[PDB]
Amino acid sequence: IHRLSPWEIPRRDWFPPSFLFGAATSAYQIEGAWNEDGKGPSTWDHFCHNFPEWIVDRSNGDVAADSYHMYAEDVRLLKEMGMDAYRFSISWPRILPKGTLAGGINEKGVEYYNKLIDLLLENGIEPYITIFHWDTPQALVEAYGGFLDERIIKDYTDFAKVCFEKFGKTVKNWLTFNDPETFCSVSYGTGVLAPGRCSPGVSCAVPTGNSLSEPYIVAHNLLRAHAETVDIYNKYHKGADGRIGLALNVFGRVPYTNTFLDQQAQERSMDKCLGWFLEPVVRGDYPFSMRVSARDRVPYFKEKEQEKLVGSYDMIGINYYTSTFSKHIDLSPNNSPVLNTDDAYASQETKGPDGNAIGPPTGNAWINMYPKGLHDILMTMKNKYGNPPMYITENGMGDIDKGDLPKPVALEDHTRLDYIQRHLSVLKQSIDLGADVRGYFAWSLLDNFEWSSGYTERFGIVYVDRENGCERTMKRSARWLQEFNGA
Amino acid sequence: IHRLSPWEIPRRDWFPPSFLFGAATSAYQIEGAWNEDGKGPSTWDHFCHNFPEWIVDRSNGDVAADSYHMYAEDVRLLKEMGMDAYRFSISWPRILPKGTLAGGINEKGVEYYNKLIDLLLENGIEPYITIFHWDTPQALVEAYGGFLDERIIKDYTDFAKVCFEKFGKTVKNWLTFNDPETFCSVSYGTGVLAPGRCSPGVSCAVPTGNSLSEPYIVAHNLLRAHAETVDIYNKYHKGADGRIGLALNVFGRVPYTNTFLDQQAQERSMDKCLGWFLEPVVRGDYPFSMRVSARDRVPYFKEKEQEKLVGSYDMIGINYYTSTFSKHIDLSPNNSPVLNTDDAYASQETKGPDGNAIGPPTGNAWINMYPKGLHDILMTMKNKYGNPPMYITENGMGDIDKGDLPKPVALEDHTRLDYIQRHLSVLKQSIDLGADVRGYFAWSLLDNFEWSSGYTERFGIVYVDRENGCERTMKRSARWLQEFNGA
Numbered sequence: 019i020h021r022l023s024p025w026e027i028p029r030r031d032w033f034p035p036s037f038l039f040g041a042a043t044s045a046y047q048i049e050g051a052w053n054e055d056g057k058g059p060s061t062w063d064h065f066c067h068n069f070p071e072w073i074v075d076r077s078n079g080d081v082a083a084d085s086y087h088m089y090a091e092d093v094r095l096l097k098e099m100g101m102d103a104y105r106f107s108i109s110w111p112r113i114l115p116k117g118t119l120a121g122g123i124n125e126k127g128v129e130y131y132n133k134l135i136d137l138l139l140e141n142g143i144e145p146y147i148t149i150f151h152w153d154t155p156q157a158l159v160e161a162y163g164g165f166l167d168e169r170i171i172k173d174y175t176d177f178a179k180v181c182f183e184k185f186g187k188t189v190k191n192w193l194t195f196n197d198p199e200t201f202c203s204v205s206y207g208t209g210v211l212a213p214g215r216c217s218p219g220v221s222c223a224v225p226t227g228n229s230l231s232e233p234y235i236v237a238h239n240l241l242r243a244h245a246e247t248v249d250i251y252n253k254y255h256k257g258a259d260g261r262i263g264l265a266l267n268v269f270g271r272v273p274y275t276n277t278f279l280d281q282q283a284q285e286r287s288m289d290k291c292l293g294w295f296l297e298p299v300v301r302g303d304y305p306f307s308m309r310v311s312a313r314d315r316v317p318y319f320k321e322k323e324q325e326k327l328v329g330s331y332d333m334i335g336i337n338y339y340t341s342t343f344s345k346h347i348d349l350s351p352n353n354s355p356v357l358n359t360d361d362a363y364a365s366q367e368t369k370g371p372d373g374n375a376i377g378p379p380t381g382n383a384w385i386n387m388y389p390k391g392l393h394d395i396l397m398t399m400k401n402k403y404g405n406p407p408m409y410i411t412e413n414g415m416g417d418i419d420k421g422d423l424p425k426p427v428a429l430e431d432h433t434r435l436d437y438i439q440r441h442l443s444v445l446k447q448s449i450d451l452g453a454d455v456r457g458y459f460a461w462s463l464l465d466n467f468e469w470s471s472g473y474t475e476r477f478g479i480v481y482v483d484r485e486n487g488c489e490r491t492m493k494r495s496a497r498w499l500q501e502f503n504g505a
Numbered sequence: 506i507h508r509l510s511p512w513e514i515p516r517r518d519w520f521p522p523s524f525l526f527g528a529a530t531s532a533y534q535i536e537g538a539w540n541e542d543g544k545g546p547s548t549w550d551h552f553c554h555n556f557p558e559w560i561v562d563r564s565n566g567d568v569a570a571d572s573y574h575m576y577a578e579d580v581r582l583l584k585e586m587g588m589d590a591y592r593f594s595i596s597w598p599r600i601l602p603k604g605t606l607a608g609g610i611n612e613k614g615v616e617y618y619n620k621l622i623d624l625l626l627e628n629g630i631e632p633y634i635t636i637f638h639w640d641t642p643q644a645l646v647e648a649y650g651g652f653l654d655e656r657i658i659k660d661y662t663d664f665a666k667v668c669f670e671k672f673g674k675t676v677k678n679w680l681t682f683n684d685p686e687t688f689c690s691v692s693y694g695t696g697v698l699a700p701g702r703c704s705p706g707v708s709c710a711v712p713t714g715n716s717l718s719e720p721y722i723v724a725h726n727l728l729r730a731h732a733e734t735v736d737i738y739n740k741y742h743k744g745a746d747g748r749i750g751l752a753l754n755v756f757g758r759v760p761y762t763n764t765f766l767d768q769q770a771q772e773r774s775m776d777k778c779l780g781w782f783l784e785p786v787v788r789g790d791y792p793f794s795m796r797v798s799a800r801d802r803v804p805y806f807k808e809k810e811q812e813k814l815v816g817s818y819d820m821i822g823i824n825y826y827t828s829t830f831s832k833h834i835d836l837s838p839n840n841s842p843v844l845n846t847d848d849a850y851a852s853q854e855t856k857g858p859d860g861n862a863i864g865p866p867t868g869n870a871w872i873n874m875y876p877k878g879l880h881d882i883l884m885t886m887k888n889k890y891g892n893p894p895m896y897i898t899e900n901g902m903g904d905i906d907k908g909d910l911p912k913p914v915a916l917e918d919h920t921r922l923d924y925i926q927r928h929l930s931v932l933k934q935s936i937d938l939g940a941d942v943r944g945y946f947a948w949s950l951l952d953n954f955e956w957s958s959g960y961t962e963r964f965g966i967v968y969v970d971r972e973n974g975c976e977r978t979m980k981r982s983a984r985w986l987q988e989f990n991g992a
């Protein structure tokens with residue numbers, strides 16, 4: 019693998035003194051303790067326990083990184099690395115086992131996050147809390163289909179309210195949703211992720227949904243929940259320095275050729291990924307291209323919530339992993355959309371017209387290394403969407419572990435270190451070109467449960483040893499980050 | 506009126522030695538002799554004779570500029586002005602009174618154009634012939650609704666064939682259609698122009714058409730006719746130096762603000778005007794934006810004709826008069842397209858967001874003076890569509906004559922001269938920036954019948970005196986052009 023020359027390797031003062039460096043996790047992927055201390059089941063419990071064959075290694079998050087119990091080790095590692103901040107998520111059904119206020123607040127759940135938050139702040143690490151990361155209380159699915167019904171909105175905002183009340187005095191940085199596009203397209207469109215729904219004829223666990231309509235329904239409910247939650251926060255919790263936003267996953271998209279049809283395809287593709295959630299919070303409606311394509315499958319916001327939607331963010335999280343080429347597909351009698359993503363009339367190609375991959379594989383099936391893509395997205399944010407305050411809230415890659423990765427080999431994560439150095443170098447170029455980015459969070463602090471891939475992909479800068487009690491060991495990437503942070 | 510400074514006034518050698526300067530007319534607008542020498546009625550005869558109240562001054566083209574009889578004066582004026590070329594059109598029903606080959610070729614019709622062509626070439630003026638300028642044989646409308654039926658295609662190509670056979674040995678520059686967008690949207694959409702059709706509830710002479718579907722039907726038939734005609738020409742007539750194309754009218758479109766929604770509106774607007782005809786001849790299909798918006802109202806080309814369509818031009822004519830701002834309209838349950846142009850989801854505003862007109866009025870109801878718009882269109886042609894060889898095949902403006910314009914005042918057309926100088930100055934900037942433009946034709950050589958405006962708008966560089974036998978007198982603009990051409 020070809021590394022950056024020594025003088026091209028980023029140094030901490032490439033970035034402003036106030037810039038944040040951190041790492042990120044999510045509740046289901048690290049916590050474990052899935053049935054402990056009163057916690058209710060989430061969709062991810064239900065999915066792993068009923069459809070184990072839909073996880074590639076038949077694994078689950080019953081234990082994960084055992085962070086419910088081992089959270090003090092999590093904080094120790096962040097401190098030793100010199101991190102300024104930490105993104106973690108709250109487990110909805112750990113706080114409200116039945117999903118609702120009326121089912122009761124689980125105080126053991128609450129105390130857990132309270133201890134975590136206290137420990138981080140005692141060590142000078144600023145918490146950035148994500149309220150929801152795909153782990154809907156299964157009881158809400160039992161009651162009404164969860165995000166498939168507008169009833170979700172009140173339960174979500176009740177949940178957010180509990181979070182703001184219990185933690186808001188100490189936590190000033192909030193994100194309502196994380197990767198809403200992945201959540202909608204992949205949990206309800208291709209059905210890869212819990213609850214695993216898709217159209218008849220699509221291969222997924224529960225092929226009785228509708229890959230053309232459900233992703234939009236769920237997206238719409240989540241956006242209404244977001245607008246309302248931001249309104250609650252602004253009215254009752256923001257005060258002098260509180261901030262709330264959301265974190266979007268954005269694939270970079272490069273026109274397959276520099277020809278108008280493929281440029282137009284790239285634009286529809288960006289609209290269908292970034293614009294789907296960003297344009298609603300920025301201007302109060304979905305991108306024109308999405309409506310004109312999918313028509314009555316895209317719902318309309320009501321007047322009052324629409325006013326709440328517009329500008330409903332203090333900052334936007336960008337989670338960036340990779341890019342593809344976007345190639346035009348003609349509208350013809352021969353093309354009939356199957357998945358919501360087909361509404362973009364574009365194919366996403368990993369190989370360009372000269373036969374070359376966009377960039378090299380980093381290990382897993384989809385993350386190709388293309389740091390220039392981040393620059394393209396940030397210039398779009400800066401020039402098209404008003405340059406809001408941004409955080410790279412996730413950036414990382416997975417090492418494959420199919421049972422023959424010796425720990426010593428796992429610790430020498432040179433590919434990951436190169437990946438991180440190169441994205442930081444591009445990020446420096448973006449900030450110098452005026453993009454308002456204020457921090458960077460590696461995905462992930464810990465090797466963890468990588469959804470349908472189970473434990474076969476390790477994304478951590480810290481190794482979690484499943485054969486040794488989930489003991490943590492800094493990888494070389496974490497050691498580099500420690501030197502970089504001057505710690 | 507504020508004129509260019511003397512050193513900013515264009516001189517002939519601003520332009521290449523091989524560059525062409527000319528003027529243009531069309532058959533119905535200048536010829537008169539509407540029922541003479543065997544000529545059949547066109548739709549424009551029929552419209553003026555049945556719906557005189559739909560011409561603002563209740564006038565018609567029975568005589569027009571009397572150019573069927575006075576054509577030798579037309580040629581004299583072109584020669585004295587030093588013009589290199591002349592664009593005129595052939596009257597379909599003057600060549601085939603019944604519209605069809607089977608109804609017979611009108612030899613008196615043929616001899617007329619033959620004399621005109623001989624006289625031009627004797628005087629060193631290159632003819633650029635337009636085959637069709639909106640004057641469909643009324644007999645074809647009687648037989649099958651003319652352009653509303655695919656039967657038009659064979660009759661048109663038969664007509665084109667007669668033209669190529671009779672004139673092609675001496676004429677090497679052909680244009681199949683002129684302003685196909687105006688022809689479709691305005692004759693079948695707003696119904697202002699013959700045959701005056703529109704949807705019930707739209708104000709026009711024959712409000713029993715459909716302003717949402719007929720413009721597309723007619724456009725589609727004209728494009729199929731074009732592809733087939735170019736194929737005939739290339740196979741049997743082109744030889745070593747023959748050239749065939751078409752001339753498109755293009756409004757400049759400026760985004761109402763430099764904001765993504767209005768930029769997107771500007772792009773849809775350009776697609777709906779320029780791209781509607783240019784993208785078919787360039788790539789073999791309509792712009793994506795037009796299909797995704799109007800769906801089943803836009804027909805599909807067949808495989809074989811589509812192959813003929815792609816690249817079916819040696820040069821593209823640009824007829825440019827004016828620009829507007831294009832402002833975004835949202836797709837909502839409240840918006841329902843009435844006219845085909847509503848499919849662009851954009852309003853065309855003559856006033857921008859600061860309250861200023863895009864440019865000043867030149868006289869009539871729609872031509873605002875905005876020469877920078879031509880530059881924008883030419884850069885689009887150069888950068889987006891491959892920079893094909895281009896001619897400004899029309900450019901001009903009208904002086905209002907409602908019966909109180911003394912001839913001496915009409916001759917001092919300073920507004921027109923300023924308009925021409927300023928567009929030539931912008932054209933110089935475009936050519937210097939690499940646009941492949943090879944000539945410029947003023948609309949019009951002669952004051953003429955300006956369609957629904959009748960004789961109330963004079964567009965000529967040469968005055969045609971209706972009170973003095975249609976005698977011709979060069980206006981100041983023509984005198985400037987004469988000095989410019991060094992003649």
Ligand SMILES: N#C[C@@H](O[C@@H]1O[C@H](CO)[C@@H](O)[C@H](O)[C@H]1O)c1ccc(O)cc1
Nearest residue numbers: 044197200204210211267412461468469
């Ligand atoms: N985009 C994306 C992926 O998810 C986000 O990135 C992490 C690495 O994949 C993941 O662990 C994290 O939870 C997410 O924020 C993604 C993951 C899985 C599937 O099927 C699609 C996308």
Ligand SMILES: N#C[C@@H](O[C@@H]1O[C@H](CO)[C@@H](O)[C@H](O)[C@H]1O)c1ccc(O)cc1
Nearest residue numbers: 531684687691697698754899948955956
């Ligand atoms: N665009 C346009 C107008 O037509 C073209 O320009 C000339 C001046 O208007 C006209 O005389 C010529 O025949 C055309 O090539 C146009 C004219 C009338 C109406 O109603 C709409 C557009």
